[PDB]
Amino acid sequence: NLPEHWTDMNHQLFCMVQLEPGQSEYNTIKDKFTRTCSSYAIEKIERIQNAFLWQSYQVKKRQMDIKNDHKNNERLLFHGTDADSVPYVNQHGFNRSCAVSYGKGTYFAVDASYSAKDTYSKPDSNGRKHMYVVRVLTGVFTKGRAGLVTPPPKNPHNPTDLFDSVTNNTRSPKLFVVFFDNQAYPEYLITFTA
Amino acid sequence: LPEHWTDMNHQLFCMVQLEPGQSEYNTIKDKFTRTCSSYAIEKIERIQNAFLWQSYQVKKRQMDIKNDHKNNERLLFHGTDADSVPYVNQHGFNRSCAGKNAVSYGKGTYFAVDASYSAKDTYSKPDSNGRKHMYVVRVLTGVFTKGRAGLVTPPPKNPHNPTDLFDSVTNNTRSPKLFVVFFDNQAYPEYLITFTA
Ligand SMILES: NC(=O)c1ccc(OCC2CCCC2)cc1
């Protein structure tokens, strides 16, 4: 069930598609980034077409939509990473096993400006920085804390019925942490400079 | 969902107690007694977890596509403590919760070929009533190599293509006795064996 806005992959299961600047898709993703990163220069935006990651992610989304008994489980967030991690994330997505104040999960920022920090989007031996735009199944969330390996339970009387993610601040979240594979789909890769 | 599962009436999860004398019970008992003849089985439960099954079967279809005509799936054992059983039944095998193995071939979830390995008190810790717990697990071993203690994912097949990974690792490729998996939904807890001395 590969999305309509994907372009043909000649029967292959993975490709990185460079977006055409000035077209609707590129402009939408650039706007999300320039909301907080207008001083950064975008070299390119690539659409990540990873059939297997998409499949696994969409299954988790359908499950979370059933479990939570409503949609609105998905947020579009940012993830800065070093150039050496980009091939892995493109192919395999996010891996909690690869500061973790809110738990031992994968971190995503609400604002590109946070992911744009050199500590996350480390400039490569050419000044280029890399940030993903990520579909994240945040679902029902709670405040995180150091040392979590999964989200807390919604009620400790049922210790296996878990929150879907944690955040720094439930009323005004700026980051989300997920603890399971295939809760996040890297949808675009932005290559940019300071 | 498999057509021989009990009707769960829209419910997403059930444990089904098997009957001795049914082929399904007897095959698991025989697989267990092959190496654990000194222990006695209290009961065997079939684990019907719709979401874990769906996610696992997606991963299996993907590995079946990627590997072409490999037997990607092995039926293996996993001993665990009573405290972990409710979590595994609902959520499967989380590498983030895994103990360090006495012989480490990587930081992942360990599965044994022989029930005797999983039957060690270090894995199937007897509970306060002397009950030991072992899962029988469909594991996507895929294409595997000898692991190494440092691993947090399986190693690449080719050092010049670091993202094209083995599916799992083992202690010995010639004579595998354990497999380690490093990803969620690569192992489906199919049966829970409750047993005693
Ligand atoms: N890679 C990223 O984009 C990213 C990394 C870390 C992120 O929050 C880290 C928390 C904020 C302060 C304490 C820990 C968010 C995003």
Grouping H, G, I as helix, E, B as strand and the rest as coil, residue A81 is: strand
Q: Ligand 1 in contact with A79 (CB < 6 A)?
A: yes
Grouping H, G, I as helix, E, B as strand and the rest as coil, residue B23 is: helix
- Which tokens sit at B57? 């079967």
**Residues B112 and B139: beta-carbon distance below 8 Å:** no
Q: What chain B residue is nearest to A50 in terms of C-alpha separation?
A: B62
- Which tokens sit at A40? 């950064």
**Residues B180 and B190: beta-carbon distance below 8 Å:** no
**Residues A101 and A128: beta-carbon distance below 8 Å:** no
Residue among B192, B194, B91 nearest B135 (CA): B192
Any B CB within 8 A of A52 CB: yes
Task: Please name the residue that has the structure tokens 């595997």.
Answer: B144
Task: Please name the residue that has the structure tokens 């004579």.
Answer: B175
Q: Mutate which of A130, A133, A175 to test ligand 1's pocket (most atoms within 8 Å of Cβ)?
A: A175
Instruction: Give the residue whose CA is nearest to atom 8 of ligand 1.
Output: A107
Any A CB within 8 A of B60 CB: no
Q: What chain B residue is nearest to A180 in terms of C-alpha separation?
A: B184
User: What is d(CA A194, CA A170) in angstroms, rounded to the nearest whole number?
Assistant: 31
Nearest ligand 1 atom to alpha carbon A115: 3
Q: What chain A residue is nearest to B86 in terms of C-alpha separation?
A: A160
Number of domains in chain A: 1
Any B CB within 8 A of A122 CB: no
Residues of A in contact with B184 (CB under 8 A): 180-182
User: What is d(CA B52, CA B101) in angstroms, rounded to the nearest whole number?
Assistant: 25
Task: Please name the residue that has the structure tokens 């996010």.
Answer: A94
Q: Ligand 1 in contact with A119 (CB < 6 A)?
A: no
Experimental method: X-ray
- Which tokens sit at A189? 């890769």
- The β-bridge partners of B132 are B195
Residues of A in contact with B91 (CB under 8 A): 150, 160, 162
**Residues B111 and B181: beta-carbon distance below 8 Å:** yes
Determine the residue among A1, A12, A60, A164 to mutate to test chain B binding: the one whose Cβ has the most chain B Cβ atoms within 10 Å.
A60
- Ligand 1 centroid vs A109 CA: distance in angstroms? 6
Task: Please name the residue that has the structure tokens 């939904």.
Answer: B185
DSSP codes joined into one string, A35-55: HHHTTSEEEEEEEEEEHHHHH
Determine the residue among B180, B182, B183, B188 to mutate to test chain A binding: the one whose Cβ has the most chain A Cβ atoms within 10 Å.
B183
One-letter amino acid for residue A7 of the chain: T
Q: Which domain holds residue A193?
A: 1-194
Which strand (E) or helix (H) includes residue A76? strand A74-81
In sequence order, what are the residues at sequence separation of 6 or more whose Cβ sits closer than 8 angstroms to the Cβ of residue A168? A102, A143, A144, A174, A175
Q: Would you say how long chain B is, in residues?
A: 197
- Which tokens sit at B143? 């294409």
Residue among B163, B168, B165 nearest A85 (CA): B163
Distances (CA, A) of B85 to A18, A57, B33, B75, B162: 46, 26, 22, 19, 35
Of B62, B86, B183, the CB nearest to A160: B86
Distance from CA of A35 to the nearest CA of B (A): 33
In sequence order, what are the residues at sequence separation of 6 or more whose Cβ sits closer than 8 angstroms to the Cβ of residue B170? B105, B141, B144, B145, B146, B147, B176, B177, B178, B179, B180
Distances (CA, A) of A17 to A32, A46, A166, B11: 19, 5, 32, 41
In sequence order, what are the residues at sequence separation of 6 or more whose Cβ sits closer than 8 angstroms to the Cβ of residue B197? B38, B39, B40, B130
Q: What chain A residue is nearest to B10 in terms of C-alpha separation?
A: A66
Instruction: Give the residue whose CA is nearest to atom 5 of ligand 1.
Output: A107
Q: What is the CA radius of gyration of chain B?
A: 17
**Dihedral, CA atoms, A190, A134, B163, A87, nearest 10 degrees?**
10
Give the ranges where chain B is alpha helix by DSSP (H). Answer: 23-36, 50-67, 85-91, 115-118
- The β-bridge partners of B77 are B112, B136
**Residues A140 and A74: beta-carbon distance below 8 Å:** no
Q: Ligand 1 in contact with A114 (CB < 6 A)?
A: yes
Distances (CA, A) of A19 to A23, A29, B77, B110, B116: 8, 10, 48, 43, 56
User: What is d(CA B128, CA B83) in angstroms, rounded to the nearest whole number?
Assistant: 11
Residue A117, sorted as left (phi over 0), alpha (psi -120 to 50) or beta, turns out to be: beta
User: What is d(CA A137, CA B87) in angstroms, rounded to the nearest whole number?
Assistant: 20
> How many other C-beta atoms are found inside a 10 Å radius of the C-beta of residue B196?
12
Nearest ligand 1 atom to alpha carbon A131: 3
User: What is d(CA B189, CA B49) in angstroms, rounded to the nearest whole number?
Assistant: 9
Task: Please name the residue that has the structure tokens 């029988």.
Answer: B136
Grouping H, G, I as helix, E, B as strand and the rest as coil, residue B81 is: coil
Q: Would you say how long chain A is, in residues?
A: 194
